[PDB]
């Protein structure tokens, strides 16, 4: 006996057919558009979407007056409005089925850092985040797969320490300044 938990979960599902043109293209488009590292990151978002869709599908089968369906449905919709893949108008359980991978990949910190014009390329954003230049609220995050909340969007600023923002020259600038 030991005081440790063994609650570990797989976050991606591999495709049934390993080599298939039309599919490989579609995944590489997603990588190319949102500068993802490998196809695991696309399968991760497919798996999460699939689980949300399966939850919506298994909720639909219950009657419209059931307390459980009402409570669970509202909670799911609230969370998907909170994360920012829907709006208050389209907040019906039926519309959960009308989402896709694009909607979820748009909410990556990498994507938002590129879309707000902090970085000048989708590839630059991932590096900039990973190099500890970017911060949300007063918290320095270096996770490209940080899924940004709707209300947390309006402040992604450069971390104050950073050379780009804070105002402290790095190794290259220091070395060039000493030999200048």
């Amino acid at each position: 006996p030991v005081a440790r938990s063994w609650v570990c979960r797989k976050t991606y599902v591999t495709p049934r057919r390993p080599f298939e043109k039309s599919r490989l293209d579609q995944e590489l488009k997603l990588i190319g558009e949102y500068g993802l590292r490998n196809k695991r990151e696309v399968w991760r978002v497919k798996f999460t979407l699939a689980k949300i869709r399966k939850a919506a599908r298994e909720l639909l089968t219950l009657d419209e007056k059931d307390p459980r369906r009402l409570f669970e449905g509202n909670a799911l919709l609230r969370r998907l409005v909170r994360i920012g893949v829907l709006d208050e108008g389209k907040m019906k359980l039926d519309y959960i089925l009308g989402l896709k991978i694009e909607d979820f990949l748009e909410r990556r910190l990498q994507t938002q850092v590129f879309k707000l014009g902090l970085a000048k390329s989708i590839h630059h954003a991932r590096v900039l985040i990973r190099q500890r230049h970017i911060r949300v609220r007063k918290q320095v995050v270096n996770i490209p797969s940080f899924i940004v909340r709707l209300d947390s969007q309006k402040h992604i600023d450069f971390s104050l320490r950073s050379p780009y923002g804070g105002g402290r020259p790095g190794r290259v600038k220091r070395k060039n300044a000493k030999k200048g």
């Binding site: 006996p1 030991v2 005081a3 440790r4 938990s5 307390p67 009402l70 409570f71 509202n74």
Partner: protein, 258 residues
């Protein structure tokens, strides 16, 4: 196995203590006493986890061994002593008195009482017997055997005992239209009024209880405790008035407060 068990694994402890998984392998293991192991509360949990006074296990025995804590007006230094339903824990150092009442969601809540109310306690009579030259006897849910009871006290009635003495001040009969509380099963901690009982000979008697908010539920006779005469309680209630309000308005209340 051979002889009685002495340990208790952490995950095997009863859920209403809310011990987390990672802190250790073992648990408190309430020692033998008036209340059952499954339905009691160790002082180590009450002090450390609920009142947030002690951090580690040593600080709890450092509190208790200095003899600052009484249970029902009697000093207990045993940190794993079982204090259960209606038991009054008294801290005369800081002048704080608590009665152990179950809350709505079915666990012992940190419900403070005035020092004037920490004088008596209500108790459900388990049996009634007589022996040795006929001095009749009574036995209650917290194992307090009392001699010469009032002959109007029958089985499943409630009695109010002054803690300084060991004598019955007043008693409540178990009849229709009396305020009761559930102490076992799905409906644990719900307060309501008796509507009727359905006697099943050679089996458990089932009672029907109507809540203050028009909610009607059933329960076994063994898991009933009369707390009030008519509708008026003889003790203070927890934060909520024992009203089981559902997840819908739980969310509405939580979001309304925000």
């Amino acid at each position: 196995a051979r002889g009685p068990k002495k340990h208790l694994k952490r995950v095997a402890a009863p859920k209403h203590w809310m011990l987390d998984k990672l802190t250790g392998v073992f648990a408190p293991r309430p020692s033998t006493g008036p209340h059952k192991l499954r339905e009691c509360l160790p002082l180590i949990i009450f002090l450390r986890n609920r009142l947030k006074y002690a951090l580690t296990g040593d600080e709890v025995k450092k509190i208790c061994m200095q003899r600052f804590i009484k249970i029902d007006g009697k000093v207990r230094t045993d940190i794993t002593y079982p204090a259960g339903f209606m038991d009054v824990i008294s801290i005369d150092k800081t002048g704080e008195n608590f009665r152990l009442i179950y809350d709505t969601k079915g666990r012992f809540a940190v419900h403070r009482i005035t020092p004037e109310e920490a004088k008596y306690k209500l108790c459900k009579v388990r049996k009634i017997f007589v022996g040795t030259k006929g001095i009749p006897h009574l036995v209650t849910h917290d194992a307090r055997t009392i001699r010469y009871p009032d002959p109007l006290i029958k089985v499943n009635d409630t009695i109010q005992i002054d803690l300084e003495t060991g004598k019955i001040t007043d008693f409540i009969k178990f009849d229709t239209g009396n305020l009761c509380m559930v102490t076992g099963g799905a409906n644990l901690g719900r307060i309501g009024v008796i509507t009727n009982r359905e006697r099943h000979p050679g089996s458990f008697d089932v009672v029907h209880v109507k809540d203050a908010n028009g909610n009607s539920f059933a329960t076994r006779l063994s898991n009933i405790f009369v707390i009030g005469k008519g509708n008026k309680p003889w003790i203070s209630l927890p934060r909520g008035k024992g009203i089981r309000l559902t997840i819908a308005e739980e969310r509405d209340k939580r979001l309304a407060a925000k």
